[PDB]
């Protein structure tokens, strides 16, 4: 299919779905605002105008046909692209100083291409919301209604708690009634972050706690996850490299960091217990299939949704929970050191590790949690060729870890970290692997007695509902909430499309290539650990094990008419239902209003609504000390105040 | 002006612009010619040692410390003006003995020694030997010598915002950290003396204090947060008493006022039930009205208030 | 010099003023908000703290010995500076997108890189200036007080309009008693907006107009000046093209121009004018020396501060008056249109040449003219890839130029091509050129039949006040106000220091090698239109010659 660009011969593909793809084949670049990253669709931005026949319409919805004369640059499409982008830029929040995706943004590109110096729209105002309770935070005055976030949280990650709200220019995305996020069932995968185009979704920055720590009396302790070595080279634009984990530690120790180690290391001895866990499990045949708790996306997500499964929950906690865990009560006393006086420094790729380190259950093991990202301003900031550091060992006894330790970084690693320990511990006659879909793996394993099990892999969340549903032949399952598995984290770095994510696994590998021990239990440390500290069952229980309780939302959300903030109270509440409202519910409600408004100086009372109580057909309700009336009225409900 | 380059600088027709100190003044000064920059104090000194003998000027003094120092001593006192103490005195003698006590109804609290540049010194270091030395291992200096007590009245949280406040004005804004630096610690410091501050204020004014004394370019940045170090030193209890309530001496909240903000009172409860005075008197669900009339100043109002609007 | 840093070998050079220059120079970098421009000094921003012998100090003003042990980054020192660049980032108009140093700010680089993402400082309320009435534009909200501008207009410029005033938190970079900069006596030569590492001092973007014009009927016609196609490419970050002019006339014919002519035809016009005016002026000796006139900001400089040497300038308009007066008043004639029809549209290196455009006395035949960053900027939003453009030449009958046209873009283009007219029509003997410093050139130029004549040339305003009064020798001075001529014009794109000139230069250069026609009498086009519409002498007057008065506050 031969076309016309301005008035050249141009040839740009056989069968295209559109023009502007065609064209982009080519190596033609029409200005857009809807290609942004994997899970973008077109037709919002209207940016892509071409002119054809005579009447200007988008380039990203025209099928190409053969001998088509088509203008790409045109004064009134220059006009028309200009004052989008200065639509787009009036209500746009332009404090890219402060910006996440400062240098790294299409429409600060954009605006800085365009020349646009001077706003001819007024910056109007929005009931804009900011969402700073999670490690993911949302500012929706840098949204530009992409709808990425949207299609990432339910088509990819299954999830669905970020959704579009309101129409036109109150247009926002959101979660259900402003709820924080951290009060929804939102796993804090961090994959909306990593689609999000604009500043709009953002990793919680923490670099001046790690400061202020640093600065301190305290001995501070890190250590590093093993897909943040497979991914840190991109922000400085270079290629892979092993041994990056060494020269990290050089900086690290440079900056004044006391112990630097290896996260593989607790990731081996994970694994170790998980093995047994799990050969236990099956030797008794009972909770079964056993699901992997490494992720604590998958952790909150069950917690959210099979509150049946959480007894089937690996007991044995993450890497960085187990890790930390030993610091603060073996290494410390190993030390004669307080264990107040430590401070711990983990270095992650997961923005939901962030909610892990802060769990009721391990309060005050991990003290920060630092994505990838975050690390590299940390090297950015000194301004040293990071690439010019000379390398050195992690610090011991936790510097040490088998291939299958650092394993773990990518999708598939604990499942075969475990198949590694069992086969050590005894024999597996064959593996046989099948791949139902692009991201299940399904594993047929036979043992040299002869009990043989089947364990599957599922990275990507959302992809375990069907899993689930469907397959019931399973005693074991790998659950990663993003895909590709802790190379495509939430906090790795920007932009985290599937080529660069399969380039981190790829690095990971060969960075698991040059280890020479194999198994966890080649790692002499670990087994030293086990041997002095780990010996009896209690404390190995209370050092690597962990409890999972169910989550449900406890919203009362009822109409507030006189709150009280606080202090001892009555809490008068009053439905408001249609069955209540037909004889007397809200002229009640108008005379403890008016009481309150010439009585009630103080908090005492609180007039408060509230909808249906499932009382009806028996007169107006009226809630007192969350307590049942029936049949209110202003001198009763004054009565049962009394 | 009063530095070095900056004074050079001025003399020469120009901005008082203080410079790096590669060519200090001594080797190149005015238009690059060697000069010899002194005190008028100094300059007085000099006939004196000529015209005796040297041992003859050591006779008083001390060891490290020879001669005299002529100080000026404000604040109030039965008899303040210029004096001349020999070094070594004590600052208690000073106060007492040469100045004759404080006048009826004031008491000592703390004594600065150098303005802006010197040091808040208490009751424990009152009795001390004035000695550059025992200063300088006393974590304070001698200063230019000027001297002002300062009674149980008034409150050191304003001593710290009023000589931050003189060193914002006066900084000749060349370097970042004096010129920015000094203008935010005098906004946490009126956050402070308005009943707005909090911990995070106090850890940043902390830390900004130590940022401003160690990357200023000359000694007017780098001593510009001394009051603040001082007065955090030796009055942590008063800033926490302005963190957590009111003035303890009272001189911010004495020409003070509380205003109900009614841009953000729901027209809650509460206030009514701390005051005794009961001056609130609002209307439910309304923003809230305090009562000037009755108004003691007692300041518990915005020890409690949700919706912190006790303005 | 054996020094360790953060506790290793390190070898720096024997003879460095300074530790942040010598590590800078062996490879070690350090953070800093000190050296941003050519006319940058140390000591201000502060950031650039080491750890030695225990006590912090900045390594700027610091003297390099032997065996040293530094710490370059250590938790406090990590602590100062985000102090330090959170301070900076408070006060400062964080507002990128309609800023001219987005994307090349070194401030914004920081924000980026030392992960600020809020500002425990309160926005504190400073009385800033805006300023909008001239070319060059002023905003002190984004001012990092650097002082980079008034050293280049007091030093480099020798103008010294704006000034430090104020102190304190109050400091700010102004013009006395904060008067519009089109009311005081700046050249509107834009070479601080071409030092400015932020958005502080800016060009007035005038792609808005232009847009409105081709959206239009009216017949836009542009012409763009010999610098702009020695500098675009760099703006794309591509190698320099030798055919780039021509790729420019393809994009502007595309986005709907009617016409694109070369303005190095008016150069050669100019020179022409110029050469036969000053050889009568010699033939006479009235007037001397004879100054040239097709820089506007030497002319504006002469304005307000030579009122004397007015009769001196040469009346013949710069290129861009003469070729846009040309056009408009011939070539619209010849079309059968009116001129109201017509929008001529000016592609230019400088900023002075849109005062000149708005000139009382011009007003009218320019409509607007834009810079290399403007025309970069619509090559950027076309996303039209400029180096796979087809090259077509520029349109009849103003679109081809000699040598000594097209060489006007650079410092001693006007003489040199003044002496090529004058050697074709009153042969040169010889030519001795002098070079008493690096922006001055005298030379003795000696004709066939008559005497001899020194001519100077003086690129960078500042130079020709000492010149003017040590010398009174020369019969002809050129000046440019930029370094290195329009080549340094403040409209190029940023950065341009003096390597970026140099190079530019030698573009240019590589250009003029290309080019067949060597002088302006062979030029076929220019003669055809001196022998057929400026015949008269009258018509030659009113359509080439202009007039100048004093500026006095
Ligand atoms: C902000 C500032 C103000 C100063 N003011 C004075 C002053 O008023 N008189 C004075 O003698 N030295 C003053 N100095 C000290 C001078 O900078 C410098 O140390 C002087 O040359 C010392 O003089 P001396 O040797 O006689 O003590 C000041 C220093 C600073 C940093
Ligand atoms: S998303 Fe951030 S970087 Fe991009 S334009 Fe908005 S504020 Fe600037
Ligand atoms: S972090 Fe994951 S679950 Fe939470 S909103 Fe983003 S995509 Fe959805
Ligand atoms: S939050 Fe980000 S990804 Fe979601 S719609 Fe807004 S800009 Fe797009
Ligand atoms: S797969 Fe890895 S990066 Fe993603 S949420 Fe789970 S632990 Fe975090
Ligand atoms: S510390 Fe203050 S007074 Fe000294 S040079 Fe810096 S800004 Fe000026
Ligand atoms: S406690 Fe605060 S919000 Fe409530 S009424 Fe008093 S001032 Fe208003
Ligand atoms: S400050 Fe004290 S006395 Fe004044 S209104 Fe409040 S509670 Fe009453
Ligand atoms: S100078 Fe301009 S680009 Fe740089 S930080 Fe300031 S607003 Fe942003
Ligand atoms: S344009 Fe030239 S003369 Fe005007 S202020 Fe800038 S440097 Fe000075
Ligand atoms: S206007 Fe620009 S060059 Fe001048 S001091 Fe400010 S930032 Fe520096
Ligand atoms: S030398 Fe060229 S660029 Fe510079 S002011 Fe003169 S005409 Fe403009
Ligand atoms: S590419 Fe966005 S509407 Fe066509
Ligand atoms: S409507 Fe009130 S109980 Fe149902
Ligand atoms: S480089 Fe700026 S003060 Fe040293
Ligand atoms: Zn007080």
């Given amino acids: 299919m031969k076309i016309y660009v301005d008035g050249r011969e141009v040839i740009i593909n056989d069968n295209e779905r559109n023009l502007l793809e065609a064209l982009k084949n080519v190596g033609i670049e029409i200005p857009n605002l809807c290609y942004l990253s994997e899970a973008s669709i077109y037709g919002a931005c209207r940016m892509c105008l071409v002119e054809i026949n005579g009447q200007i319409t988008t380039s990203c919805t025209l099928k190409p046909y053969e001998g088509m004369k088509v203008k790409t640059n045109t004064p009134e499409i220059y006009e028309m692209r200009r004052n989008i982008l200065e639509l787009i830029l009036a209500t746009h929040n332009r404090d890219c100083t402060t910006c996440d995706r400062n240098g790294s943004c299409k429409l600060q590109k954009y605006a800085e291409d365009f ?81 999000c185009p604009t500043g709009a979704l953002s990793i919680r920055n923490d670099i001046d706690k790690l400061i202020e720590a640093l600065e301190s009396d305290k001995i501070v302790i890190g250590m590093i996850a093993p897909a943040v070595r497979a991914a840190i080279q991109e922000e400085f634009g270079i290629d892979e ?24 290391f607790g990731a081996d001895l994970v694994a170790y217990e998980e093995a047994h866990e799990f050969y236990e499990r099956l030797k008794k045949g009972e909770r079964l299939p056993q699901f992997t708790s490494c992720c604590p996306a998958w952790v909150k997500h ?48 997961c923005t939901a590790k962030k909610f892990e380190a802060e769990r009721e259950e391990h309060e005050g093991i991990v003290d920060i949690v630092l994505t990838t990202r975050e690390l590299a301003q940390l090297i950015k900031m000194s301004r040293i060729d990071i690439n010019r550091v000379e390398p050195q060992p992690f610090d011991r006894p936790y510097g040490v870890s088998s291939q299958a330790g650092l394993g773990f970084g990518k999708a598939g690693g604990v499942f075969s970290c475990v198949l590694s320990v069992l086969n050590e511990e005894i024999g ?129 959300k009822d109409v507030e008419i ?7 109270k009555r809490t008068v509440k009053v439905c408001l239902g249609t069955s209540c409202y037909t004889k007397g519910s809200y002229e009640i409600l108008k005379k403890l209003v008016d009481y309150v408004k010439e009585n009630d100086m103080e908090g005492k009372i609180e007039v408060l609504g509230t909808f249906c109580v499932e009382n009806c057909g028996a007169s107006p309700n009226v809630i007192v000390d969350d307590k049942i009336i029936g049949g209110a009225t202003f001198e009763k409900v004054l009565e049962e105040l009394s | 002006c009063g530095e070095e380059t900056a004074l050079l600088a001025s003399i020469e027709g120009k901005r008082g612009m203080p410079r790096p100190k590669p060519p200090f003044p001594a080797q190149s000064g005015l238009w690059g010619k060697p000069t010899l920059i002194n005190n008028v104090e100094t300059y007085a000194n000099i006939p004196r040692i000529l015209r005796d003998g040297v041992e003859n000027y050591r006779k008083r003094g001390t060891e490290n410390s020879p001669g005299t120092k002529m100080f000026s001593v404000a604040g109030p006192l039965k008899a303040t003006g210029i004096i001349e103490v020999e070094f070594g005195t004590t600052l208690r003698d000073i106060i007492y003995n040469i100045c004759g006590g404080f006048v009826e109804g004031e008491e000592f609290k703390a004594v600065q020694i150098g303005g ?8 424990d270091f009152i009795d001390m030997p004035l000695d550059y030395d025992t200063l300088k291992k006393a974590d304070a200096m001698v200063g230019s010598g000027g001297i002002v007590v300062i009674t149980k009245k008034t409150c050191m949280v304003e001593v710290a915002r009023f000589f931050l406040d003189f060193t914002k004005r006066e900084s000749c804004g060349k370097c970042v950290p004096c010129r920015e630096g000094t203008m935010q610690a005098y906004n946490i410091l009126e956050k402070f003396t308005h009943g707005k501050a909090t911990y995070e204020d106090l850890k940043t004014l902390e830390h900004l204090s130590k940022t401003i004394k160690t990357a200023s370019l000359c000694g007017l940045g780098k001593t510009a947060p001394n009051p603040i170090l001082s007065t955090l030193k030796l009055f942590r209890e008063e800033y926490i008493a ?38 609130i008197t609002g209307e439910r669900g309304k923003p809230y009205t305090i009562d000037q009339e009755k108004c003691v100043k007692c300041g518990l109002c915005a020890s409690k208030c949700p919706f912190k609007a006790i303005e």
């Fill in chain 1, 428 to 556: 597996i006659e064959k593996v046989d692997v099948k791949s139902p879909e692009d991201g299940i793996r399904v594993a047929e394993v036979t043992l040299k007695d002869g009990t043989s099990f089947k364990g599957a892999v599922i990275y990507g969340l959302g992809k375990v509902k069907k899993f689930l549903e469907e397959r019931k032949d399973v005693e074991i399952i790998e659950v990663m909430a993003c895909n590709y598995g802790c190379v495509g984290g939430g906090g790795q770095p920007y932009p985290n499309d599937s080529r660069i994510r399969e380039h981190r696994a790829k690095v990971l590998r060969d960075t698991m290539g040059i280890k020479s021990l194999l198994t966890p239990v080649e790692n002499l440390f670990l087994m030293k650990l086990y041997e002095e500290d780990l010996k009896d069952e209690h404390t190995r229980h209370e050092i690597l094990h962990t409890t999972y309780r169910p989550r449900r939302r406890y919203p009362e």
């Fill in chain 1, 115 to 195: 020349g646009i110096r001077k706003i001819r729209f007024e910056a109007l105002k929005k009931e804009h919301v900011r969402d700073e309770s999670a490690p993911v935070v949302r500012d929706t005055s840098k949204c530009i209604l992409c709808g990425d976030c949207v299609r990432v949280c339910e088509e990819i990650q299954g999830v669905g708690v970020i959704e579009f709200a309101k129409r036109g220019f109150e247009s926002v995305v959101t979660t259900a009634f402003d709820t924080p996020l951290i009060e929804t069932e939102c796993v804090l995968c961090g994959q909306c972050v990593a689609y």
């Fill in chain 1, 241 to 264: 490299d092993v041994a990056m984990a060494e020269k990290l530690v050089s900086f690290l120790k440079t900056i004044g960091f006391d112990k630097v180690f290896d996260v593989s």
């Fill in chain 1, 562 to 568: 006189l709150p009280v903030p606080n202090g001892e």
């Fill in chain 1, 302 to 349: 069950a917690e959210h949704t099979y509150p049946q499964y959480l007894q089937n929950l690996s007991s044995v906690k993450s890497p960085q929970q187990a890790l930390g865990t030993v610091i603060k009560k073996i290494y410390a006393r190993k030390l004669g050191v307080p264990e107040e006086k430590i401070f711990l420094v983990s270095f992650m790729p």
């Fill in chain 2, 116 to 123: 802006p540049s010197g040091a808040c010194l208490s009751e």
């Fill in chain 2, 242 to 279: 302005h963190i957590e309530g009111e003035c303890p001496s009272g001189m911010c909240t004495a020409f003070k006022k509380y205003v109900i903000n009614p841009d953000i009172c729901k027209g809650c409860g509460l206030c009514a039930r701390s005051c005794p005075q009961n001056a």
